Amino acid sequence: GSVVIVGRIILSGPITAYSQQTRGLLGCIITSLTGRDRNQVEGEVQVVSTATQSFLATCVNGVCWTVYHGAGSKTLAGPKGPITQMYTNVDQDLVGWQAPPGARSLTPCSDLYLVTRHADVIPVRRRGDSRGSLLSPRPVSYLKGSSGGPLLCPSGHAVGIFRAAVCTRGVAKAVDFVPVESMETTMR
């Protein structure tokens, strides 16, 4: 079935965010089977779900990007029917669909800010190409459902999308992400 937008996170001085639900469980299941989603889209970050899992998608330069381990090869439910992936890069764990019209695109970009599923903004320190550390460690449960979420620079430009957390005893210390560069490498 399709990936279905079930909510959104709208981003803002310092970086703030809030979440808004747009779909319920049943409408999620049905929209997944039809691929037809007639709802208005808003914001830079979409909350997305299949019938078995949910996660995040980030709009960067007119492409709505997420993790392959969340979305697999699936279409995104859209106003004219299902939307085929424009990019499908399995080795990078990256996929993208053309961004639906109303979505707000971020533009590409070392103190970074991770935006979680609950619309908390948490400081991250870049530690190389595709890894960052959490400046204030939190339980990994606090990051549940945030895969595909954006890593921002202080001006709110996009640095990458969040992929996995490195954990010790249930505490997340580091985040693994897909760099905005890998989106550019993918795009050509």
Binding site: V6, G7, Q21, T22, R23, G24, L25, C28, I29, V47, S49, T50, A51, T52, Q53, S54, F55, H69, G70, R117, V140, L143, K144, G145, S146, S147, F162, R163, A164, A165, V166, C167, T168, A172, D176
Partner: peptide
């Protein structure tokens, strides 16, 4: 250490027991 993927259950607010 442990490398964790961060998918949740289906829907906007996934149900837990």
């Amino acid at each position: 250490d442990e490398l964790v993927y961060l998918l949740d259950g289906p829907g906007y607010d996934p149900i837990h027991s």
